[PDB]
């Protein structure tokens, strides 16, 4: 009990940066309760730069070992559509991850207050899929794809974030089985805790497409647990606003929201899909952001 705490803390120490970041970070401004703790922005004293700091209490996780994943897996990851992690530290009983601050905030604010058009939807889906093709080719599953995990720059550039539940697969351990995600976005094979791969993020992306069209995921008013039962048991959920979606968006969505995971399109395939040729540039997103509306 105390023994498992102390061991866990020593283990994490081997993968985090040594040192106390409190000596260099000032002006903490809370922006969220995120997945697994609080997210603040702060100023780096030596550079004047703003960063985002996620702080996760070691004693408050459902599965403490998941805290190993992001801090190891995302360590020196560079991709234009993925939130960059700068360092991590152990501060008392908290893990702090310091990362790039996305001043445009999250896609959730948009999707609940406005209606994206298909140009904008394709731009988001292209960005996310560029991120997921590269991630998935090196064994990394995100496992919490939803609008809250998509962040924006001031000029409409899109980046994937919230890697806290991400997982690494490999040749010798190619599948995971953990019930991890956000209930309404979870793939049905993951709900059933069957072995699963990168395919799970493709299904969640489908649900996020439903968010972008309808405003919310299917069965959102149902309590989480029954909603999960429905997803597991029913046929693919349908858009409420289907009459407003183009034939190419419908055909795109049909390749995402497939139950049989071996039939579901991969990110690399979806990158070639004609829906994505409608993608707008970063500027097309900017009108939707809270500050411009």
């Amino acid at each position: 009990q105390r023994v498992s705490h102390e061991q866990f803390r020593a283990a994490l120490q081997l993968v985090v940066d040594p040192g106390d970041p409190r000596s260099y970070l000032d002006n903490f401004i809370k922006i969220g309760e995120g997945s697994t703790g609080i997210v603040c922005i702060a100023t780096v004293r030596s550079s004047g730069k703003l960063v985002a700091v996620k702080k996760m209490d070691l004693r408050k996780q459902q599965r403490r070992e998941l805290l190993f994943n992001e801090v190891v897996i995302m360590r020196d990851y560079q991709h234009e559509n993925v939130v960059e992690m700068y360092n991590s530290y152990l501060v008392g009983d908290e893990l702090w991850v310091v990362m790039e601050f996305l001043e445009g905030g999250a896609l959730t604010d948009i999707v609940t207050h406005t209606r994206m058009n298909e140009e904008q939807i394709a731009a988001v889906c292209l960005a996310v899929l560029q991120a997921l093709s590269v991630l998935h080719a090196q064994g990394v599953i995100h496992r919490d794809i939803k609008s809250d995990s998509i962040l924006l720059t001031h000029d409409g550039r899109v980046k994937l974030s919230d890697f806290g539940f991400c997982a690494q697969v490999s040749k010798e351990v190619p599948r995971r089985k953990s019930l991890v995600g956000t209930p309404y976005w979870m793939a049905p094979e993951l709900i059933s805790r069957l072995p699963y791969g990168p395919e799970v993020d493709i299904w969640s992306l489908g649900i996020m497409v439903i968010e972008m069209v309808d405003g919310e995921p299917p069965y959102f008013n149902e309590p989480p647990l029954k909603a999960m039962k429905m997803i597991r048991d029913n046929l693919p959920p349908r858009l409420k606003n289907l009459h407003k979606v183009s034939p190419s968006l419908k055909g795109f969505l049909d390749r995402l929201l497939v139950r049989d995971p071996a039939q579901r399109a991969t990110a690399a395939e979806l990158l070639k899909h004609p829906f994505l040729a409608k993608a707008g540039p970063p500027a097309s997103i900017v009108p939707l952001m809270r500050q411009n509306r």
């Binding site: 995600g181 956000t182 209930p183 309590p223």
Partner: peptide, 13 residues
């Protein structure tokens, strides 16, 4: 209903 919060099953606790 309408919850945006993640769920992690503590299956090994």
């Amino acid at each position: 209903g309408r919850s945006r919060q993640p769920l992690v099953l503590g299956d090994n606790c």
